[PDB]
Amino acid sequence: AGLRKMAQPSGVVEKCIVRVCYGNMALNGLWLGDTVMCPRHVIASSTTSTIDYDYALSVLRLHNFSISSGNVFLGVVGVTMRGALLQIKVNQNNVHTPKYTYRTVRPGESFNILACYDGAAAGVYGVNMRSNYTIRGSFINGAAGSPGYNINNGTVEFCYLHQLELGSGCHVGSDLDGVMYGGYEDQPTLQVEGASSLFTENVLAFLYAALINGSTWWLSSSRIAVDRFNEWAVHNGMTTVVNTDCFSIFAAKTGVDVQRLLASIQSLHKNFGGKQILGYTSLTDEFTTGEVIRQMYGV
């Protein structure tokens, strides 16, 4: 019992964090094998005016780098641009490199943030990629390079390196190929985020877990058709639901059909009536059906 936005254990990722310092800039890097990845704006002279990243790279002096994992200091053999990231070849292999892949996450998918400061893991929390391709994190200045990751069957799937902030709960990274999520730029310019839409599939996972956990007061005694709901959704900040198939397993443990929850969503949208649901007073799309099943059942 209990639903908690949690994080997978950070142990295997913790040993891959380095401090990457260039001139007076310092941030975090990810050190895998003999390569360190980190945001390229560590070689910028100032993050207040537009940056010619190609220029900074051409005038870059290797000896100006100081990369360290604790007091293991890493010699820099080479530097290449990888989109919004720098691919730095170092003279030592990280012997604690886990088995890993890279994967670009899509909106509505959950992953873990290992929030890092001055090259050291500071904390860990779960996040969910919003439809405007930002995450609701807690990064201060100097947290750039913090990795996002999932763990499946002993493999670490890296999906995120923190890059920038464009609002209070609004954080943007690149995947490990260097592609900025949402196509935002790593420039101190006027960019604003796109509007967000609640991932209806995730909200339904949340409300199922609410029922499983004995919270039922909000459950509608009406029903709305998926097609009907989808026409309502595009006008009230919610994604359409495409496959009702994955909730078959949930509608057994409870005697509640999707169409019942979908009517509940419409009233709960913009109102919980003074009450809460598992601590929440507003619809959350941070939980996927996978997350919820893992937490209630271990399957």
């Binding site: 704006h41 993050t47 923190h162 902030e165 954080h171 730029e185 790593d186 101190p188 006027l190 960019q191």
Partner: peptide
């Protein structure tokens, strides 16, 4: 934007 803030480059963190």
């Amino acid at each position: 934007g803030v480059n963190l």
